[PDB]
Every structure is written in structure tokens, then in C-alpha cells.
Coordinates of C-alpha atoms in Angstrom, one line a residue:
X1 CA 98.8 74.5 131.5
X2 CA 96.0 72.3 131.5
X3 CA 93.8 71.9 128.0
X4 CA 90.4 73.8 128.6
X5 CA 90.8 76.4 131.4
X6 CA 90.4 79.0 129.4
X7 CA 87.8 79.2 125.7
X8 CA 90.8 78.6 123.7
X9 CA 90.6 75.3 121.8
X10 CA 94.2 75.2 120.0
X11 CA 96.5 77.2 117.9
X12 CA 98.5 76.9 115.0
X13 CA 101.9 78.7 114.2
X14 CA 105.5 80.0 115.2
X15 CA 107.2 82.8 114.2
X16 CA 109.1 82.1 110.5
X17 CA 108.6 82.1 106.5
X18 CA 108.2 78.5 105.9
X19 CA 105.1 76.4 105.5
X20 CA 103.1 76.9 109.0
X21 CA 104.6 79.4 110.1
X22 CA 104.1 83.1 110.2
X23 CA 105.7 86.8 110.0
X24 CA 102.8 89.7 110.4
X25 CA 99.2 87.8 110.2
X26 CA 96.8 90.0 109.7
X27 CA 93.5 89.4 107.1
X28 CA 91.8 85.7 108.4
X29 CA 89.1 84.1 107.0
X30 CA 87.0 80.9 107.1
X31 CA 85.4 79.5 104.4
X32 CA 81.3 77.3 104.7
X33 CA 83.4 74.6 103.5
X34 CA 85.4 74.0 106.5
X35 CA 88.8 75.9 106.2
X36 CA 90.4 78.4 107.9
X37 CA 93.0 81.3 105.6
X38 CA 95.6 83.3 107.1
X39 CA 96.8 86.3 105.4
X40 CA 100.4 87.4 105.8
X41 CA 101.7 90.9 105.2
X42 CA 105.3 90.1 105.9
X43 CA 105.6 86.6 103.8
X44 CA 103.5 87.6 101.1
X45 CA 101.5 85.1 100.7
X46 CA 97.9 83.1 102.0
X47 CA 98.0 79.7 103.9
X48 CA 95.0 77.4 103.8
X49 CA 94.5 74.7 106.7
X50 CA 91.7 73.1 107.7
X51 CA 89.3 73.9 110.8
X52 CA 91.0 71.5 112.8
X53 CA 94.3 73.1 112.4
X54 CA 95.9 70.7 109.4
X55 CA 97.9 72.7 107.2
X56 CA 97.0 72.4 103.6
X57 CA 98.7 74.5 100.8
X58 CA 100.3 77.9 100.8
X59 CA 100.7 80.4 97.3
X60 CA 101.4 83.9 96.8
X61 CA 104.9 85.3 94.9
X62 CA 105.7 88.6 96.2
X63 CA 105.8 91.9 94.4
X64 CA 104.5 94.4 92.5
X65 CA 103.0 93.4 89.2
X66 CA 99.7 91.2 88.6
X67 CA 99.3 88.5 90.0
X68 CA 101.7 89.3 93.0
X69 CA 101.5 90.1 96.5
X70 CA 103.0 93.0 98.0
X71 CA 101.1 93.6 101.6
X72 CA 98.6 91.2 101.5
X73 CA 96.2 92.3 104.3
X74 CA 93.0 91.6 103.9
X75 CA 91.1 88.1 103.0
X76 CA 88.0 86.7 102.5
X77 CA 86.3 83.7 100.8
X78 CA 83.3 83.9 97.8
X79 CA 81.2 81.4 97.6
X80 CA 82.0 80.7 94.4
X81 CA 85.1 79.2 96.3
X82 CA 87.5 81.5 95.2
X83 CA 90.2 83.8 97.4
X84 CA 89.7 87.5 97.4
X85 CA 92.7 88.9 99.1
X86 CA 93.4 93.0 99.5
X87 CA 96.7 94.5 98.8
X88 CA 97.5 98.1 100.9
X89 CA 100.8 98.4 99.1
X90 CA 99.4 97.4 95.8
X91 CA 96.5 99.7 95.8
X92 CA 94.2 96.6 94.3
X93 CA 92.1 93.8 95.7
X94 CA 93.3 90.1 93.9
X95 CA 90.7 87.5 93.1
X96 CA 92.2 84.1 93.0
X97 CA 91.0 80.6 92.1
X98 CA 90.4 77.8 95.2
X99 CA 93.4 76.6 94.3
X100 CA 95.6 79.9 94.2
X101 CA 95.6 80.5 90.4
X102 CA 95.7 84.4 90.1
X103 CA 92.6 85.0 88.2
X104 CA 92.0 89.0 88.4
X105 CA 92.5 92.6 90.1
X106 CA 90.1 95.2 91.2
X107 CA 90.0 98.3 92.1
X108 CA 93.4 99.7 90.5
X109 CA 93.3 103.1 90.1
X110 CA 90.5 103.9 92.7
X111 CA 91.3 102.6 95.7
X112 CA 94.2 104.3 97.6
X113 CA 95.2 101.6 100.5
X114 CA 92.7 98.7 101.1
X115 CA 92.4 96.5 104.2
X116 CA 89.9 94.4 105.4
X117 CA 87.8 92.5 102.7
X118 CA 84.6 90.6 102.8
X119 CA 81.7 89.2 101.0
X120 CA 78.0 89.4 101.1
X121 CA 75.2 87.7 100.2
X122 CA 74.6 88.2 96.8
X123 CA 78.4 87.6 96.6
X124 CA 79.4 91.0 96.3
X125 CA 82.8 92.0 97.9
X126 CA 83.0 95.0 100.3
X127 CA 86.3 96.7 100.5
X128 CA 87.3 98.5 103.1
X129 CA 89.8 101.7 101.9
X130 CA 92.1 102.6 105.2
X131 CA 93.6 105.1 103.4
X132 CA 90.6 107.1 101.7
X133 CA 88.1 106.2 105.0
X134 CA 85.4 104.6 102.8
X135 CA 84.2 101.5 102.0
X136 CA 83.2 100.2 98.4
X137 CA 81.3 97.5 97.1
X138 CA 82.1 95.7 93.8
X139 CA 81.1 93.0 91.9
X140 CA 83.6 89.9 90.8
X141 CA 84.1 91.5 87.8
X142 CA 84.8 94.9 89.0
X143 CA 82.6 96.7 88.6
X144 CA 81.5 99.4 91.5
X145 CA 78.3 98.8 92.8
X146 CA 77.8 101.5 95.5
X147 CA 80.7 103.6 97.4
X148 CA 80.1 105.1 100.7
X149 CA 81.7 106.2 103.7
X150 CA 84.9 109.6 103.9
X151 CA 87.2 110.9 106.4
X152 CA 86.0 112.5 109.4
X153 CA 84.7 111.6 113.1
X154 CA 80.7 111.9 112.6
X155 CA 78.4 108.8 112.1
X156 CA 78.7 108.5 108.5
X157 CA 82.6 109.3 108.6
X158 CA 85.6 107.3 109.0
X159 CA 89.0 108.0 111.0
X160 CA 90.6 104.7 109.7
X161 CA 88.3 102.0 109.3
X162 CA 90.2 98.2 109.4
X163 CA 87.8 95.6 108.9
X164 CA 84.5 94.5 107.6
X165 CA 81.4 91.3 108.4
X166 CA 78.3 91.2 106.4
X167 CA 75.5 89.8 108.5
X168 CA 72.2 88.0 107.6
X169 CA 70.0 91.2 106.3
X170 CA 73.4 91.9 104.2
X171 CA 73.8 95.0 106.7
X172 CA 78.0 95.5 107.0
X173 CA 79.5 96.5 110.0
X174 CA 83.4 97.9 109.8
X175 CA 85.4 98.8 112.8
X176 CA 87.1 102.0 112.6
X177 CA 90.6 101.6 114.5
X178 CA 91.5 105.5 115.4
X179 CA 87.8 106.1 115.9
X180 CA 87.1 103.5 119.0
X181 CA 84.1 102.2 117.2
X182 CA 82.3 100.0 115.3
X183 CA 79.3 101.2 113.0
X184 CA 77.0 99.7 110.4
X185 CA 75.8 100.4 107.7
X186 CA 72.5 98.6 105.5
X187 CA 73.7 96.9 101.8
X188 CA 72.9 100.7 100.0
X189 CA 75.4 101.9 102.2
X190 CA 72.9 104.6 104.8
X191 CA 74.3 104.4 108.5
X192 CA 72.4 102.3 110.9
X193 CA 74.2 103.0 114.0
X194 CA 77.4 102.6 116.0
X195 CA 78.9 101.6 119.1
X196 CA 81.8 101.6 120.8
X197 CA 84.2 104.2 122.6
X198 CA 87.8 105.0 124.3
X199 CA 88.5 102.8 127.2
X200 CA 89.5 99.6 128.9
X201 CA 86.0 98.9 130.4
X202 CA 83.2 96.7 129.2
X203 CA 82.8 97.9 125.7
X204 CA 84.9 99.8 125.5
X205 CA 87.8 100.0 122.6
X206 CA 91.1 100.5 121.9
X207 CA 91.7 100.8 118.5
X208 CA 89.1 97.6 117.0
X209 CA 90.6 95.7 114.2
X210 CA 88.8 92.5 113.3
X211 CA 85.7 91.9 113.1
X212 CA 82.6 88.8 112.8
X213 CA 79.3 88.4 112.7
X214 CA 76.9 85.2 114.1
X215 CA 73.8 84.3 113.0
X216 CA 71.8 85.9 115.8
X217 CA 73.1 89.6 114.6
X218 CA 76.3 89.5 117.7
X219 CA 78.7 91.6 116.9
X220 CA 82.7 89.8 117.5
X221 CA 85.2 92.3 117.7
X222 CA 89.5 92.1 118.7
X223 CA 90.5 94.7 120.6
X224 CA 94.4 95.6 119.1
X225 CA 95.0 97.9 121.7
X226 CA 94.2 95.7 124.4
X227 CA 94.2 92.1 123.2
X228 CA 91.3 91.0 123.7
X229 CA 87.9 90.2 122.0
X230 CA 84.5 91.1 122.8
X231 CA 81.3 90.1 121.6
X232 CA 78.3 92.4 121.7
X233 CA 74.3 91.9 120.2
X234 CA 73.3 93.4 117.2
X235 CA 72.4 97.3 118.2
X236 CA 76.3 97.3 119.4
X237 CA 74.8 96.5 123.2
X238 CA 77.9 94.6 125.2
X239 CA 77.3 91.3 126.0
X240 CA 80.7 89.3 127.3
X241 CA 84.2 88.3 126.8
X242 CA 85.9 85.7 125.1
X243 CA 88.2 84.9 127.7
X244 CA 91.4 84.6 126.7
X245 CA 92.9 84.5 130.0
X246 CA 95.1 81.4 130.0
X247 CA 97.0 82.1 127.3
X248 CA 96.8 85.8 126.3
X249 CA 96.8 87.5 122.9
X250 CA 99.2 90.1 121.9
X251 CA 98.0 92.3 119.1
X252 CA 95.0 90.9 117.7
X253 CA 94.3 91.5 114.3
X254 CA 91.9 89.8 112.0
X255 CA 88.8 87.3 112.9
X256 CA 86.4 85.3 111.8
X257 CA 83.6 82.9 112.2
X258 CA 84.4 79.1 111.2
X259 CA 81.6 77.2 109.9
X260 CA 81.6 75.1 113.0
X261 CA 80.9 78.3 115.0
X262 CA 84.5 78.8 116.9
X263 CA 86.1 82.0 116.8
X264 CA 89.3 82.3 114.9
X265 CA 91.7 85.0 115.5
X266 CA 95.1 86.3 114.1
X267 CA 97.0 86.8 117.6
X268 CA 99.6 88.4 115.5
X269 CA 101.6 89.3 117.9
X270 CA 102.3 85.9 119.2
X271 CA 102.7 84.7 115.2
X272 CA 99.8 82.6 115.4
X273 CA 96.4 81.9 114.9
X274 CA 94.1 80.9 117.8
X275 CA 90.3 79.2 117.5
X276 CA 88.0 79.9 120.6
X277 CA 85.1 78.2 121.5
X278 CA 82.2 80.8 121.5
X279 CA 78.5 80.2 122.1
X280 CA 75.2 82.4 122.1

């Protein structure tokens, strides 16, 4: 179909386990620096391209020890430049050097199966625990700066929380994916508020899996259940659709916001990545 009839500017991938191409997407992430990182459960390992689409490395060995990948879900990118990436089968979140040196682990022994990973703005990295429902906080060198967040269906409580964005006042926002809802919380960890409930109307959810953040306080969430994305303001008030239309997703799972302002999506189910033009 014709280029532009829809807010999808291009996408990168087909279905594989060489370089460019992917098995199970999940974690994505985009870097102030002008790349885009694609985590991949199934390959075990990260690829790095550019915002434009170029591909530039690939690194991750598979397995259990240190230093390995196992499920890599989660990713996200410190200012310091280097790759944090969140391993649910490993039970640890890996800190790697720009260049995919291994560097560190956190988290062994406490967290039971981590997802979504991101950073905030005093470079912390927030850690969101699918497995335990709650969300921690750590510094780069591991140590635990504030936990918060347990199983349950009330506003402080989790049913299975996915993904995490920090936004300007270093308030995090996580979606909860058997919960139908999104909720934030400030940097100490007290609940703010949250949004979101069972449907296939406007604002409505099911099961929300990644999520971003813009620099007026909207909210961009996928919608797993039913492919789509969905951008709200900052008190979790809907406010429109990306559309997608022309060439649909199919099982979105991570997102993020490039440093050009485009959306970028793991449309996992397609076994690619798309980038969206968004505006507000």
C-alpha cells in the first residue's frame, strides 16, 4: 500500500535468528543518543540499530551463568550509556557496557521473575517483578533503594505488572497486564492514581504491556490483547489512537519513545519492530 496512509513510518525485521531478524521481541528501548534496542526472549540476545532503521551490532550468549542471557525481556538505556537488560528466567537484571561487554548483575537472590526495566532521572533503574507483583528501585551498583508494590487488585497492588516509563517529575507509571490498568506511582514509591479498565472501547484495555512517557506527562500504552496503542494525558484521561490501521499489529509488546519523538513498538507478533509518527 501506499507509504503514509496510515502513522506508521517504517519497520524493521522478519521472523529468524540471524542479524535483523527476530524470534519473540519483547523489552524495546531507545536511547537520547539516537538508537533504537530490541530485546529478544527467544534468540537471547539485544540488537542495536539506529533511529532510522540501520542495523548496527547484536551480543548476548545464551544461558544460565553470568554474563548470559536466558529470557531476556526487559531493556532499557542509562545515561551513562550502558544497557540494562532484565532476565525472567534468570531471576537478575544485567548491566552491560555501550558496547555489549557484560559488566554486572543485580538483583540475584531477590527478585523472583523480572520484566520490564527502566531508568529514571537520577539514573536509578526501576525493575518491574512479574512474578512477585512489585516493583524495585536500585542503584547501578545494586543496591536497593526503595521497594514497593505486592500481589493483589487494590490501588497499591499488582495482578501482574509488565512494564515501566519514568516521566519528568521522576513519577513511574507500570501497566499491570491481568489488572486492565495502568497506575503510577511518585519516585518514594506512594500511589498517585490509575486508569484504565476491561474493554475494547476508548480506554479501555486488554491486558496493557508496554508502556512510554512524553514530555507533556501523555501516557503511551500497547494494548496486547487487542493490538493496538493508545495515548492518554497525564491523570490517565484518554486522548486518541495511534492508528495503526494500514498495516496492523499483532501482539504488541514493548514501546518506547525515540529521541526524535516517534513511537517505537515491538509488534511481536508480526516479528518486527514498527516506528509511528506521534504528535501532541
Amino acid at each position: 500500500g501506499p507509504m503514509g496512509e496510515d502513522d506508521l513510518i517504517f519497520r524493521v525485521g522478519t521472523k529468524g535468528r540471524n542479524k535483523g531478524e527476530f524470534t519473540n521481541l519483547q523489552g524495546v528501548a531507545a536511547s537520547t543518543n539516537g538508537k533504537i534496542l530490541i530485546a529478544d526472549s527467544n534468540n537471547q540476545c539485544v540488537q542495536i540499530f539506529s533511529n532510522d532503521g540501520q542495523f548496527k551490532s547484536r551480543f548476548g550468549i545464551r544461558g544460565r551463568s553470568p554474563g548470559q542471557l536466558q529470557r531476556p525481556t526487559g531493556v532499557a538505556v542509562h545515561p551513562s550509556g550502558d544497557i540494562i537488560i532484565a532476565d525472567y528466567d534468570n531471576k537478575w537484571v544485567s548491566i552491560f557496557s555501550s558496547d555489549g561487554k557484560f559488566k554486572t548483575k543485580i538483583g540475584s537472590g531477590k527478585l523472583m521473575g523480572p520484566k520490564g526495566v527502566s531508568v529514571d532521572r537520577n539514573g536509578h533503574i526501576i525493575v518491574v517483578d512479574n512474578k512477585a507483583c512489585c516493583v524495585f528501585i536500585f542503584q547501578p551498583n545494586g543496591k536497593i533503594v526503595t521497594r514497593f508494590g505486592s500481589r493483589g487488585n487494590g490501588d497499591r497492588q499488582f495482578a501482574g505488572p509488565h512494564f515501566a516509563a519514568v516521566n519528568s517529575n521522576n513519577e513511574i507509571i507500570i501497566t499491570d497486564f491481568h489488572n486492565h490498568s495502568v497506575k503510577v506511582f511518585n519516585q518514594e514509591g506512594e500511589f498517585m492514581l490509575k486508569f484504565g479498565s476491561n474493554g475494547e472501547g476508548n480506554g479501555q484495555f486488554n491486558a496493557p504491556t508496554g508502556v512510554a512517557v512524553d514530555s507533556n506527562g501523555n501516557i503511551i500504552v500497547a494494548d496486547w490483547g487487542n493490538s493496538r496503542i493508545q495515548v492518554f494525558d497525564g491523570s490517565g484521561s484518554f486522548l486518541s489512537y495511534i492508528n495503526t490501521s494500514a498495516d496492523p499489529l499483532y501482539g504488541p509488546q514493548g514501546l518506547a519513545l525515540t529521541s526524535d519523538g516517534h513511537v517505537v513498538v515491538a509488534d511481536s507478533g508480526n516479528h518486527c519492530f514498527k516506528v509511528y509518527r506521534y504528535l501532541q
